Amino acid sequence: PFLDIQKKLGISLDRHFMFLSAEQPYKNAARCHAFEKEWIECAHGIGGTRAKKECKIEFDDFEECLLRYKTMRRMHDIKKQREKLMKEGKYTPPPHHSGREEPRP
Amino acid sequence: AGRISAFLKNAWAKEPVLVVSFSVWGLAIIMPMISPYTKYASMINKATPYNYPVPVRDDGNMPDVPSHPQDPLGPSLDWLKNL
Amino acid sequence: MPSTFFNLTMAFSLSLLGTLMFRSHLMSTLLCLEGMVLSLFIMTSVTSLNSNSMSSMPIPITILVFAACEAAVGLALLVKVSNTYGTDYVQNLNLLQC
Amino acid sequence: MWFEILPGLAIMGVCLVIPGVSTAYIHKFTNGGKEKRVARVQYQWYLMERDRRISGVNRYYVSKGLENI
Amino acid sequence: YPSKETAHWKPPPWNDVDILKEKAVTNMTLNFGPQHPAAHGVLRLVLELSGEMVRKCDPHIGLLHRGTEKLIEYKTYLQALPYFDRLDYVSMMCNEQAYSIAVEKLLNIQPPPRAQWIRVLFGEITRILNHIMAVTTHALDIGAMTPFFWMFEEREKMFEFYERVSGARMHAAYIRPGGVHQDLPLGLLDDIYEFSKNFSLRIDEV
Amino acid sequence: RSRAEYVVTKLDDLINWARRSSLWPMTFGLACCAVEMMHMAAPRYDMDRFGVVFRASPRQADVMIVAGTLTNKMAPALRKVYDQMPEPRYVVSMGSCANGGGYYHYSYSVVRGCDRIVPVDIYVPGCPPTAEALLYGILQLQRKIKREQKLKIWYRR
Amino acid sequence: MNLYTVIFINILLSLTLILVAFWLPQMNLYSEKANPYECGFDPTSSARLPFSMKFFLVAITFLLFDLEIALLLPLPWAIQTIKTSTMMIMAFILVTILSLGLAYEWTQKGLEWTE
Amino acid sequence: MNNYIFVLSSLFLVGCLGLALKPSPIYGGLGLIVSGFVGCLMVLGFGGSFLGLMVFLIYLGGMLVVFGYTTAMATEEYPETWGSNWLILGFLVLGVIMEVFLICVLNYYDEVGVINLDGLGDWLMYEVDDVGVMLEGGIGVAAMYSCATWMMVVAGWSLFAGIFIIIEITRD
Amino acid sequence: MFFINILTLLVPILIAMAFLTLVERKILGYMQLRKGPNIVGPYGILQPFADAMKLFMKEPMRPLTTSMSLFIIAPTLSLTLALSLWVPLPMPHPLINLNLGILFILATSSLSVYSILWSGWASNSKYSLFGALRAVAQTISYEVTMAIILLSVLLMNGSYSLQTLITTQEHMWLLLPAWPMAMMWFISTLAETNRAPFDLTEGESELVSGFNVEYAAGPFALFFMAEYTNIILMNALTTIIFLGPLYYINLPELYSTNFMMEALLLSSTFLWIRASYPRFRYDQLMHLLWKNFLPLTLALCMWHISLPIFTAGVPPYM
Amino acid sequence: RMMRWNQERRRLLIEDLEARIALMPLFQAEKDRRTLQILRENLEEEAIIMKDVPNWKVGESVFHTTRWVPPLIGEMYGLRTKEEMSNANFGFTWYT
Ligand SMILES: CCCCCCCCCCCCO[C@@H]1O[C@H](CO)[C@@H](O[C@H]2O[C@H](CO)[C@@H](O)[C@H](O)[C@H]2O)[C@H](O)[C@H]1O
Ligand SMILES: CCCCCCCCCCCCO[C@@H]1O[C@H](CO)[C@@H](O[C@H]2O[C@H](CO)[C@@H](O)[C@H](O)[C@H]2O)[C@H](O)[C@H]1O
Ligand SMILES: CCCCCCCCCCCCO[C@@H]1O[C@H](CO)[C@@H](O[C@H]2O[C@H](CO)[C@@H](O)[C@H](O)[C@H]2O)[C@H](O)[C@H]1O
Ligand SMILES: CCCCCCCCCCCCO[C@@H]1O[C@H](CO)[C@@H](O[C@H]2O[C@H](CO)[C@@H](O)[C@H](O)[C@H]2O)[C@H](O)[C@H]1O
Ligand code: SF4
């Protein structure tokens, strides 16, 4: 912060709920807790400029976990290729993908 | 303090609602400080297990941790059973 | 989530466009501010739910608390405007050009 | 006389017992002779879904005891 | 720097206070009655209102003006008497008594003793009839509907005293210059006594 | 006649019965005659036990009881509230003043009978009619409504 | 699904009654019948003109007091906390300042309606 | 049911378009009430409960005050609706057409970007703790009383100071 | 089967509403030394059906100054919301089991005021506008304390779930520990239902008919049906919150019978109150709530936060 | 009386929550196997559906890291019926 009063007094008015990995009620981890913990820990102590290049792996993973652009696209591609094959009559979904599974347990 | 007593008596006769409101407000603050059961309310919230108690790896240096849930080690709840 | 957040951002943009493009009533503009508040509340709430961020759920409530204070002051000002001119029209609020 | 008010009251009284009684009976009829399950929390929903999956007939309320293992 | 656009600008006021044209008084004007529960069916009370604050009451009357006073000029004195029943038509016999006394004065005659006691007796029965209507309808306008019903059953019994002396429940035409039209039927005083000894309890309930 | 005519006739009875049984007069009274109207509502006669309930709004009223003298100054207002009653609507003229001007028939300021202003279904004589005489007229209006044949006439058109 | 189903039936029942009420009865539309009611005389102005609000200050106070109760409605979940003393102080302080705010407005005559 | 949340967020968008056109504040107030209800449904749809019901309750109270203020200080002889003015009506219709166009085109160019009409319903709930107990949104809000007390201090101060502020603004 | 259950809630509630119009008119009559309806059916039991058939056979108003969309919508919204308030009511098992059923009630009840506000505004007449602005004032009066009163009670319940109130009261009426809140709650439900002595939005002695003055025929009947349904609802709610009917897991119908008896009694006191008191002035209702109920409600909320902590009596979350 | 009854209701809740604790290991093991089997089934159909697609790697992660990433609901039920997907999105929240 512009004035680091909280750090000087050693208190926490708003430092402890700043990101996903922070403490949650009843220890219910937020989505992408492990990815955000890895990104924050990679970046610690080296500054923002270096962190941008050198923690790029961690940020991309966390970004994928949270926003899920690649996961959505990959499923869109599989479901689109399945639509093409079924119209051509070359693919038949199995019974467990058609609602006739043998449920577990 | 005879001047206030006449004041309080008049307020009781003429503005009883406000007298009750202030008295109830003052009692609500006072009661937790003088009650012997105040300490248990936090202890009861602390004994409610909403989460799975994850076991610890035994390293051979845990004389205080039970090895079974019916070992005589660990936190007892006899205080609550007889509350 | 993807399409819902797009629509919510568009809803904010429309409410802001409403705020920026005055008609006559000041009250109609005060309603557009409440529209932006409402959009931002849902966006914050949906984000917290989608990420399971329970420590952030106080924040949407604080958004509404200060919006209520903003709306109360806006209405209080509107009483003053109406007392001066007998309407809430913004074209009367032009004495400070000179 | 005042007791001539009672025919309307009795009709009111009968009409106000039917909703409670009918809901309780229709629940048992549609939940295998038991109370309709209440899923206040996700854990309870999970148990119902597991009950539905092991039932063999896709109904959570058809229960399986030790005869099934 | 003067410009064509800003040629009409004046300097602001020295104390920042502008003299603006007088703002428009915009009170709501409302017809309260004649067709209104509180208007007695014939009062057109024109109200100036600010919110529900009443700024002016302008009562428009004459919606029951029937020209009684002109009509009386074409009547004999006895023929005019029933017009007085229909003035304060809640206090019928008292209106008769006023007109009877005025005529008796101009005639320089007096009504006999028993007539005067009857006239006071029924004058005070009439006052109760009036105060019941005054109190309970006033309560009914304020929302307390029930006292109207208890006390109008008492009124119905007093209408029977009217009908027993005169044959009419309301417009008796019973008090006339010179006394009253007929003497009391046998048994009327006893029934007035029976009513009178219970009425104060009816007042206590209200 | 036919079974379609029989059914129509029974429906006339049903709708007629409903309007008979729930007559809501306007809270509307002009002079002394209105006092006797209060006495019909009072406990001895209790008009509400027949289903008769005053409502102040003309939009929620079925009957206008012209209970008192109708002056020229009042006539437009009475016509207005009559026009603002939804149909089907009925008028009961109560007392000599409303019936034909009564004691004030020859006045410059008085309408000689409210039936110069509105249509009238029942004329109740008296000055005032007793609460019971008014109640009799209300029960005569109910029997008039019982005779309405609007659906039978529609069927035969 | 069930909550959606019953509320739609509630909407469906209400709208059917409205349609019956508008298409069953015999009508007779004419101007004097449909003019606005005002006790038998014509209105002298529109009902759409400004209507003064004498309790306007209580009204905007109600806006703030309605967000105060919104801050109080999590209390059933908050009493489950281990940090009972913290929760209790926060709730006590919150209620007390709201009382002081009401007390100030009361003594400033802010609850009195304007004349 | 796979279109449920998109339909709701689409209804919400129309409500804000109606508000943005600024008819008489009477209908503006109604527009926010409907949008608030639709917004409550969206929060519910994403697994919310307390937050959705709060915002509707708060906006029900808020628009009742605005109704009262509108009848006193923001009213004209002929209040405008959305249909009253051809120009406002046209931009209402054009705005709805431009919404269909914007969603249609964005679906074509990316197909999975901002708009993914093929995948609607597949990406609403991401993760859910299946066997959990303490998970409802009210628990999160209640942290103001224990773990996020600073959030409640500032919220409480603003309401308290708001009383003193509005009393000062409104005195003559 | 769920559709049959909807019928066996809605239809009996609508018949209960219709006969409450009869019970009100007879109870008021007898307190006034009259009889009330006793001709239209035996002891007047067909009088509600006659009034219903009359109204829906009557010409409905189409006033010229009226803004017609809101004019039609408002009575439609009124009956919808009145019926919707019943679906989460546990008697002892609800049709719809809601986690935050109490908050559902407040939100639904709070939307109900807009039927009054919009009908009065849409009618575009002076007496209807007066009635609408009294509704604005009425809600500001009571809504400020109604939710805090509920809040304090539910700190002994431990949740917003209506079904949990049954278990909370297994051994004792909530009346006993909460009677001061029960008293304030009871006055609030009278104002919330626009009932005497707070029948101000209609108040016929002052505004002729207030918000619904321009309404006729079947549209008028919807407002009346909605008002009488809400009276039963609010008293049934008072019964479940404070007067916990006796519950036994193997005798559910015992709860329903006991619930009905107490709900019938609380509805009778509503009619009894109407027959007894004059009307408040609508500025005086605001002062009653904001200068008497609100101070005590705030003190008692603080007391009911304090109580479970210092008695170690926090109710369970589940 | 409320103090005593609520103290009893707190003891009952602990007993109920302790029954859940005892059973949670079994539910965790079942859920692990169920999730993995569903993911396995998706992988086999991906091997057939994406057979003749250039540059497609069957089973490829979208992440650099090699630690286990739990699947999303969209991933698990992406290839199954609309009802199974709707039940996962709305089952609990629409059960009343
Ligand atoms: C593609 C276009 C198709 C052709 C469209 C033709 C439309 C013509 C509609 C004619 C009107 C019908 O609409 C209806 O008319 C009747 C009588 O006519 C009137 O209805 C009411 O008012 C009048 C007033 O005197 C009474 O005579 C009538 O008995 C009553 O029912 C109303 O005006 C309307 O309810
Ligand atoms: C200007 C605004 C003024 C209004 C605000 C005033 C707030 C002040 C509150 C004073 C009361 C605090 O009351 C305090 O309650 C807590 C629990 O809540 C008690 O705390 C006790 O019980 C708790 C459990 O809850 C134990 O963990 C603790 O060790 C024990 O002290 C304190 O003994 C008592 O002192
Ligand atoms: C104000 C109201 C606005 C209404 C807005 C429009 C509502 C209707 C939404 C249409 C959007 C697409 O709606 C629907 O999306 C689903 C995903 O859930 C698609 O899903 C389905 O078809 C597509 C291929 O065609 C594949 O994903 C797959 O075969 C199947 O899941 C549907 O084919 C599409 O029709
Ligand atoms: C000038 C005006 C400002 C002065 C008035 C305000 C005074 C401050 C009052 C608010 C005090 C907040 O006090 C602060 O509380 C939080 C919890 O909420 C504590 O936070 C502590 O517990 C949390 C629980 O999650 C941990 O995550 C955190 O790491 C730890 O520090 C802080 O250690 C304490 O400093
Ligand atoms: S008829 Fe007789 S009683 Fe009736 S108003 Fe005329 S004078 Fe009075």
PDB file of N, CA, C and O in Angstrom, chain I residues 240-271:
ATOM      1  N   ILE I 240     -46.506 -21.289  13.537  1.00  0.00           N
ATOM      2  CA  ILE I 240     -45.339 -22.155  13.432  1.00  0.00           C
ATOM      3  C   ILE I 240     -44.138 -21.557  14.166  1.00  0.00           C
ATOM      4  O   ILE I 240     -43.318 -22.291  14.721  1.00  0.00           O
ATOM      5  N   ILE I 241     -44.011 -20.235  14.200  1.00  0.00           N
ATOM      6  CA  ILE I 241     -42.832 -19.625  14.804  1.00  0.00           C
ATOM      7  C   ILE I 241     -42.924 -19.634  16.327  1.00  0.00           C
ATOM      8  O   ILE I 241     -41.970 -20.011  17.010  1.00  0.00           O
ATOM      9  N   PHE I 242     -44.064 -19.231  16.882  1.00  0.00           N
ATOM     10  CA  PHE I 242     -44.180 -18.988  18.315  1.00  0.00           C
ATOM     11  C   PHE I 242     -45.018 -20.008  19.067  1.00  0.00           C
ATOM     12  O   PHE I 242     -44.874 -20.104  20.285  1.00  0.00           O
ATOM     13  N   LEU I 243     -45.899 -20.746  18.395  1.00  0.00           N
ATOM     14  CA  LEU I 243     -46.847 -21.624  19.077  1.00  0.00           C
ATOM     15  C   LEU I 243     -46.682 -23.080  18.673  1.00  0.00           C
ATOM     16  O   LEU I 243     -47.660 -23.824  18.662  1.00  0.00           O
ATOM     17  N   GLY I 244     -45.449 -23.481  18.357  1.00  0.00           N
ATOM     18  CA  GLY I 244     -45.086 -24.816  17.931  1.00  0.00           C
ATOM     19  C   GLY I 244     -46.100 -25.920  18.165  1.00  0.00           C
ATOM     20  O   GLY I 244     -46.171 -26.500  19.251  1.00  0.00           O
ATOM     21  N   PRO I 245     -46.902 -26.240  17.147  1.00  0.00           N
ATOM     22  CA  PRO I 245     -47.842 -27.354  17.284  1.00  0.00           C
ATOM     23  C   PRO I 245     -47.126 -28.658  17.597  1.00  0.00           C
ATOM     24  O   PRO I 245     -45.981 -28.874  17.203  1.00  0.00           O
ATOM     25  N   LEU I 246     -47.823 -29.528  18.316  1.00  0.00           N
ATOM     26  CA  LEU I 246     -47.226 -30.762  18.800  1.00  0.00           C
ATOM     27  C   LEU I 246     -46.843 -31.673  17.646  1.00  0.00           C
ATOM     28  O   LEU I 246     -47.676 -32.023  16.812  1.00  0.00           O
ATOM     29  N   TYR I 247     -45.579 -32.081  17.620  1.00  0.00           N
ATOM     30  CA  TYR I 247     -45.034 -32.888  16.542  1.00  0.00           C
ATOM     31  C   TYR I 247     -44.625 -34.250  17.075  1.00  0.00           C
ATOM     32  O   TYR I 247     -43.929 -34.342  18.087  1.00  0.00           O
ATOM     33  N   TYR I 248     -45.070 -35.300  16.395  1.00  0.00           N
ATOM     34  CA  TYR I 248     -44.615 -36.661  16.639  1.00  0.00           C
ATOM     35  C   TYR I 248     -44.329 -37.300  15.294  1.00  0.00           C
ATOM     36  O   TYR I 248     -45.176 -37.269  14.400  1.00  0.00           O
ATOM     37  N   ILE I 249     -43.139 -37.882  15.151  1.00  0.00           N
ATOM     38  CA  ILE I 249     -42.708 -38.371  13.845  1.00  0.00           C
ATOM     39  C   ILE I 249     -43.672 -39.414  13.301  1.00  0.00           C
ATOM     40  O   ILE I 249     -43.836 -39.539  12.084  1.00  0.00           O
ATOM     41  N   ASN I 250     -44.326 -40.167  14.173  1.00  0.00           N
ATOM     42  CA  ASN I 250     -45.261 -41.192  13.730  1.00  0.00           C
ATOM     43  C   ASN I 250     -46.701 -40.700  13.647  1.00  0.00           C
ATOM     44  O   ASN I 250     -47.568 -41.466  13.225  1.00  0.00           O
ATOM     45  N   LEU I 251     -46.980 -39.450  14.019  1.00  0.00           N
ATOM     46  CA  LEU I 251     -48.325 -38.878  13.945  1.00  0.00           C
ATOM     47  C   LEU I 251     -48.247 -37.486  13.320  1.00  0.00           C
ATOM     48  O   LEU I 251     -48.515 -36.474  13.976  1.00  0.00           O
ATOM     49  N   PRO I 252     -47.861 -37.399  12.045  1.00  0.00           N
ATOM     50  CA  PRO I 252     -47.803 -36.075  11.396  1.00  0.00           C
ATOM     51  C   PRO I 252     -49.130 -35.335  11.377  1.00  0.00           C
ATOM     52  O   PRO I 252     -49.151 -34.111  11.539  1.00  0.00           O
ATOM     53  N   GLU I 253     -50.240 -36.040  11.178  1.00  0.00           N
ATOM     54  CA  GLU I 253     -51.537 -35.376  11.112  1.00  0.00           C
ATOM     55  C   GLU I 253     -51.902 -34.692  12.422  1.00  0.00           C
ATOM     56  O   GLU I 253     -52.664 -33.724  12.404  1.00  0.00           O
ATOM     57  N   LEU I 254     -51.368 -35.163  13.551  1.00  0.00           N
ATOM     58  CA  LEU I 254     -51.561 -34.460  14.814  1.00  0.00           C
ATOM     59  C   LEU I 254     -51.020 -33.041  14.740  1.00  0.00           C
ATOM     60  O   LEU I 254     -51.626 -32.109  15.276  1.00  0.00           O
ATOM     61  N   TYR I 255     -49.865 -32.860  14.101  1.00  0.00           N
ATOM     62  CA  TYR I 255     -49.344 -31.517  13.904  1.00  0.00           C
ATOM     63  C   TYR I 255     -50.308 -30.687  13.068  1.00  0.00           C
ATOM     64  O   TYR I 255     -50.619 -29.545  13.415  1.00  0.00           O
ATOM     65  N   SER I 256     -50.820 -31.263  11.975  1.00  0.00           N
ATOM     66  CA  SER I 256     -51.703 -30.513  11.085  1.00  0.00           C
ATOM     67  C   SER I 256     -52.980 -30.085  11.794  1.00  0.00           C
ATOM     68  O   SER I 256     -53.457 -28.964  11.603  1.00  0.00           O
ATOM     69  N   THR I 257     -53.561 -30.973  12.597  1.00  0.00           N
ATOM     70  CA  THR I 257     -54.782 -30.629  13.315  1.00  0.00           C
ATOM     71  C   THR I 257     -54.525 -29.543  14.347  1.00  0.00           C
ATOM     72  O   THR I 257     -55.308 -28.594  14.470  1.00  0.00           O
ATOM     73  N   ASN I 258     -53.441 -29.676  15.104  1.00  0.00           N
ATOM     74  CA  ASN I 258     -53.101 -28.675  16.102  1.00  0.00           C
ATOM     75  C   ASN I 258     -52.736 -27.353  15.440  1.00  0.00           C
ATOM     76  O   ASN I 258     -53.108 -26.284  15.930  1.00  0.00           O
ATOM     77  N   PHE I 259     -52.020 -27.414  14.318  1.00  0.00           N
ATOM     78  CA  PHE I 259     -51.670 -26.209  13.577  1.00  0.00           C
ATOM     79  C   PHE I 259     -52.920 -25.460  13.140  1.00  0.00           C
ATOM     80  O   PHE I 259     -53.014 -24.237  13.291  1.00  0.00           O
ATOM     81  N   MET I 260     -53.896 -26.185  12.597  1.00  0.00           N
ATOM     82  CA  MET I 260     -55.113 -25.545  12.114  1.00  0.00           C
ATOM     83  C   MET I 260     -55.863 -24.862  13.248  1.00  0.00           C
ATOM     84  O   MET I 260     -56.380 -23.752  13.081  1.00  0.00           O
ATOM     85  N   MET I 261     -55.951 -25.518  14.402  1.00  0.00           N
ATOM     86  CA  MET I 261     -56.698 -24.956  15.521  1.00  0.00           C
ATOM     87  C   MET I 261     -56.088 -23.637  15.976  1.00  0.00           C
ATOM     88  O   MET I 261     -56.793 -22.638  16.142  1.00  0.00           O
ATOM     89  N   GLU I 262     -54.770 -23.612  16.162  1.00  0.00           N
ATOM     90  CA  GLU I 262     -54.111 -22.381  16.570  1.00  0.00           C
ATOM     91  C   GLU I 262     -54.168 -21.330  15.474  1.00  0.00           C
ATOM     92  O   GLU I 262     -54.291 -20.137  15.762  1.00  0.00           O
ATOM     93  N   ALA I 263     -54.049 -21.748  14.215  1.00  0.00           N
ATOM     94  CA  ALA I 263     -54.146 -20.795  13.116  1.00  0.00           C
ATOM     95  C   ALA I 263     -55.556 -20.229  13.004  1.00  0.00           C
ATOM     96  O   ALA I 263     -55.730 -19.034  12.748  1.00  0.00           O
ATOM     97  N   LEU I 264     -56.574 -21.071  13.189  1.00  0.00           N
ATOM     98  CA  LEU I 264     -57.946 -20.579  13.210  1.00  0.00           C
ATOM     99  C   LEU I 264     -58.142 -19.565  14.325  1.00  0.00           C
ATOM    100  O   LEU I 264     -58.811 -18.545  14.136  1.00  0.00           O
ATOM    101  N   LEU I 265     -57.580 -19.839  15.499  1.00  0.00           N
ATOM    102  CA  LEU I 265     -57.729 -18.926  16.623  1.00  0.00           C
ATOM    103  C   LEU I 265     -57.051 -17.591  16.347  1.00  0.00           C
ATOM    104  O   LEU I 265     -57.614 -16.530  16.633  1.00  0.00           O
ATOM    105  N   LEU I 266     -55.840 -17.620  15.788  1.00  0.00           N
ATOM    106  CA  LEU I 266     -55.133 -16.377  15.513  1.00  0.00           C
ATOM    107  C   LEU I 266     -55.823 -15.568  14.427  1.00  0.00           C
ATOM    108  O   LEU I 266     -55.794 -14.336  14.462  1.00  0.00           O
ATOM    109  N   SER I 267     -56.439 -16.239  13.456  1.00  0.00           N
ATOM    110  CA  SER I 267     -57.240 -15.527  12.468  1.00  0.00           C
ATOM    111  C   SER I 267     -58.482 -14.909  13.093  1.00  0.00           C
ATOM    112  O   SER I 267     -58.916 -13.836  12.670  1.00  0.00           O
ATOM    113  N   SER I 268     -59.065 -15.564  14.095  1.00  0.00           N
ATOM    114  CA  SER I 268     -60.235 -15.000  14.754  1.00  0.00           C
ATOM    115  C   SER I 268     -59.887 -13.729  15.514  1.00  0.00           C
ATOM    116  O   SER I 268     -60.698 -12.801  15.575  1.00  0.00           O
ATOM    117  N   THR I 269     -58.699 -13.672  16.118  1.00  0.00           N
ATOM    118  CA  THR I 269     -58.324 -12.465  16.842  1.00  0.00           C
ATOM    119  C   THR I 269     -58.100 -11.296  15.891  1.00  0.00           C
ATOM    120  O   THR I 269     -58.282 -10.144  16.284  1.00  0.00           O
ATOM    121  N   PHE I 270     -57.729 -11.572  14.637  1.00  0.00           N
ATOM    122  CA  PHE I 270     -57.664 -10.514  13.631  1.00  0.00           C
ATOM    123  C   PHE I 270     -59.037  -9.892  13.399  1.00  0.00           C
ATOM    124  O   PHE I 270     -59.160  -8.672  13.277  1.00  0.00           O
ATOM    125  N   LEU I 271     -60.077 -10.720  13.325  1.00  0.00           N
ATOM    126  CA  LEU I 271     -61.428 -10.205  13.126  1.00  0.00           C
ATOM    127  C   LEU I 271     -61.941  -9.542  14.395  1.00  0.00           C
ATOM    128  O   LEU I 271     -62.623  -8.516  14.339  1.00  0.00           O
TER     129      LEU I 271
END
